[PDB]
Amino acid sequence: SLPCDICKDVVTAAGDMLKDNATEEEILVYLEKTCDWLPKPNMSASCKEIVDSYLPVILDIIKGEMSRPGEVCSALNLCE
Numbered sequence: 356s357l358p359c360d361i362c363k364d365v366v367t368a369a370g371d372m373l374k375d376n377a378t379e380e381e382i383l384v385y386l387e388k389t390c391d392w393l394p395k396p397n398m399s400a401s402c403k404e405i406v407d408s409y410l411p412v413i414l415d416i417i418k419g420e421m422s423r424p425g426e427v428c429s430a431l432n433l434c435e
């Protein structure tokens with residue numbers, strides 16, 4: 356179906372963007388800068404340690420999901 360082909364191309368494009376070797380680094384810097392809203396030195400440092408540890412964990416989950424564009428698109432009722 357057209358909505359299915361479109362949905363699967365969009366999820367593919369998302370997955371390719373996330374596979375890009377500079378994407379995770381860009382996100383990491385952005386989230387570490389956010390931690391700088393916290394007092395220093397200790398709270399901001401603890402926040403950066405949680406980001407550094409968990410961002411690649413969360414990224415991996417998303418990328419895994421984008422690797423199955425049919426499944427994603429079925430969950431949205433766009434592929435059947």
Ligand SMILES: CCCCCCCCCCCC[N+](C)(C)[O-]
Nearest residue numbers: 358359361362363365366431433
């Ligand atoms: C995850 C990206 C989704 C892009 C696919 C676009 C959704 C197609 C819209 C289908 C529903 C339109 N409607 C209401 C007339 O059925």
Ligand SMILES: CCCCCCCCCCCC[N+](C)(C)[O-]
Nearest residue numbers: 361362363364365366367368369
């Ligand atoms: C009337 C405009 C012609 C095409 C309109 C529908 C195209 C939806 C955009 C597809 C998404 C592009 N993509 C997959 C590279 O991200």
Ligand SMILES: CCCCCCCCCCCC[N+](C)(C)[O-]
Nearest residue numbers: 357358361362364365366368369
């Ligand atoms: C119902 C309209 C279908 C459009 C689905 C949404 C497409 C995601 C847009 C990403 C931008 C990609 N691009 C090349 C079209 O710019």
Ligand SMILES: CCCCCCCCCCCC[N+](C)(C)[O-]
Nearest residue numbers: 361362364365366368369427431
């Ligand atoms: C489920 C689809 C959610 C993604 C929506 C975001 C679309 C990003 C494309 C932005 C492009 C806009 N513009 C004017 C710069 O072309």
Ligand SMILES: CCCCCCCCCCCC[N+](C)(C)[O-]
Nearest residue numbers: 365366367368369370372421427
């Ligand atoms: C579950 C997927 C929803 C994410 C929708 C956002 C589309 C990201 C694709 C961006 C591709 C870059 N591009 C073609 C606009 O230059």
Ligand SMILES: CCCCCCCCCCCC[N+](C)(C)[O-]
Nearest residue numbers: 366368369370372373417418421
């Ligand atoms: C949401 C799943 C992961 C993909 C996130 C999609 C949003 C990014 C689309 C913005 C396009 C990026 N760019 C190069 C124009 O800055």
Ligand SMILES: CCCCCCCCCCCC[N+](C)(C)[O-]
Nearest residue numbers: 365366369370372417421427431
């Ligand atoms: C379902 C998760 C997708 C949500 C993230 C989509 C956000 C796309 C934002 C791109 C904005 C592009 N620009 C240059 C016009 O700002």
Ligand SMILES: CCCCCCCCCCCC[N+](C)(C)[O-]
Nearest residue numbers: 372373375377378381382414417
């Ligand atoms: C769903 C997890 C968060 C997705 C947010 C990713 C947005 C990245 C901004 C565009 C940068 C990607 N790239 C390839 C141009 O470097």
Ligand SMILES: CCCCCCCCCCCC[N+](C)(C)[O-]
Nearest residue numbers: 381382383385386410413414417
């Ligand atoms: C997995 C958590 C995702 C939410 C984080 C949003 C990512 C923002 C990355 C955009 C980087 C901004 N910029 C333009 C300086 O590249």
Ligand SMILES: CCCCCCCCCCCC[N+](C)(C)[O-]
Nearest residue numbers: 384385386387388389390391392
């Ligand atoms: C738990 C998911 C991550 C939530 C991320 C919230 C970040 C939004 C705050 C904007 C940060 C902007 N800046 C320029 C300081 O990097």
Ligand SMILES: CCCCCCCCCCCC[N+](C)(C)[O-]
Nearest residue numbers: 386389390392393402403405406
């Ligand atoms: C650990 C992943 C989440 C990254 C975002 C960090 C949250 C700190 C933002 C709270 C802002 C602090 N304050 C006092 C300026 O509001």
Ligand SMILES: CCCCCCCCCCCC[N+](C)(C)[O-]
Nearest residue numbers: 386388389390391392393402405
């Ligand atoms: C899980 C926590 C994610 C939320 C992080 C966003 C914090 C928003 C507070 C922004 C306030 C920053 N400032 C400098 C304007 O005070």
Ligand SMILES: CCCCCCCCCCCC[N+](C)(C)[O-]
Nearest residue numbers: 385386388389390391392393413
């Ligand atoms: C876990 C979901 C929470 C993610 C959303 C948190 C974003 C907070 C952004 C507030 C930014 C405030 N300000 C004015 C500095 O931009």
Ligand SMILES: CCCCCCCCCCCC[N+](C)(C)[O-]
Nearest residue numbers: 392393394395396397398399402
């Ligand atoms: C050393 C600074 C003293 C308190 C620092 C920790 C407070 C965290 C901020 C709580 C969130 C505020 N709230 C719940 C209204 O959003």
Ligand SMILES: CCCCCCCCCCCC[N+](C)(C)[O-]
Nearest residue numbers: 392393394397398399401402405
């Ligand atoms: C580990 C540090 C604990 C901070 C948790 C994040 C608090 C969310 C910030 C929302 C902004 C609320 N307020 C009043 C503090 O600005």
Ligand SMILES: CCCCCCCCCCCC[N+](C)(C)[O-]
Nearest residue numbers: 398400401402403404405406408
């Ligand atoms: C949903 C908002 C969450 C705000 C709560 C802040 C998280 C507290 C950090 C506990 C973990 C610190 N650590 C790694 C030293 O255990």
